[PDB]
Design a protein around this ligand. Structure first.
Ligand SMILES: CN1CCN(c2ccnc(C(=O)N3CCC[C@H](C(=O)Nc4cccc(-c5ccc6c(c5)C(=O)NC6)c4)C3)c2)CC1
Ligand SMILES: CN1CCN(c2ccnc(C(=O)N3CCC[C@H](C(=O)Nc4cccc(-c5ccc6c(c5)C(=O)NC6)c4)C3)c2)CC1
Lengths: 118, 120
């Protein structure tokens, strides 16, 4: 799974963030380089093998002035080599960059069976 | 004397971080109802509430920038401008200004103020 882009749990807070597996560190763990530059060891069970976050996934969308809310991925777009998510909330859609989309513990848990490593 | 109506820095249970808000109710036995400056509300134990507004000078804090970037820094100034509070935060010998909604405390940072500023 080394070099693959994933969505993984940051241990200290239960949230799942996009990043890449850089190394297999053994004991069921892998080194992760997160898209924000942070690094840590994550257990295979806490790594979802999906890039991009799939359509119809319930996510946490991050706005300006630290505001965040739940919504559903209804689109993917590529623009100048960057990924954007079209997130639906109360029948309307807004575009969010890859760095503005995360999963809560419960939202991530929902993808474990189909996308988890373990 | 009651702490109800006072502006504080309180722990949000789900992540260990401390945020500015106001105590709205004494819900008995050392717990209080909190209205946070972002509009969120919950019950917080007195021991997890810091009685300080503004966050004092020389406090180690977590400063929030744009595009979700955050870092540790030390409060070296307080400024009132157009009726609003700003914190001058020092990081590796340089200072930047942050609004009240861009300054929080981690679990360890808030724990350090419990003995001097905590309620319970
Ligand atoms: C008093 N109030 C206090 C606040 N409060 C919370 C209630 C529940 N949860 C929280 C919380 O705590 N969070 C949710 C909002 C986003 C927070 C985050 O996670 N910030 C961040 C900060 C820095 C970076 C990246 C980031 C992004 C996207 C990506 C990456 C990296 C990355 O590596 N790949 C993709 C995100 C977490 C607050 C309500 C009550
Ligand atoms: C892969 N990466 C993923 C990200 N990652 C983390 C490592 C440690 N911690 C976090 C984290 O999770 N947080 C830190 C950054 C701010 C996050 C927050 O707390 N966001 C927020 C969201 C919404 C509102 C208010 C807010 C503000 C100020 C105030 C109030 C309300 C308020 O009520 N009074 C004052 C803040 C929490 C990420 C590093 C590794």
């Amino acid at each position: 799974f080394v070099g693959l882009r994933v969505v993984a749990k940051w241990s200290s807070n239960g949230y799942f963030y996009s990043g890449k597996i850089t190394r297999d560190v053994g004991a069921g763990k892998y080194k992760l380089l997160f898209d924000d530059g942070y690094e840590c060891d994550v257990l295979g069970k806490d790594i979802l093998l999906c890039d991009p976050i799939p359509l119809d996934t319930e996510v946490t969308a991050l706005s300006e002035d630290e505001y965040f809310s739940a919504g559903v991925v209804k689109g993917h777009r590529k623009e100048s080599g960057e990924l954007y998510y079209s997130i639906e909330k109360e029948g309307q859609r807004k575009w969010y960059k890859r760095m503005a989309v995360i999963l809560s513990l419960e939202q991530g848990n929902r993808l474990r069976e189909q996308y988890g490593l373990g």
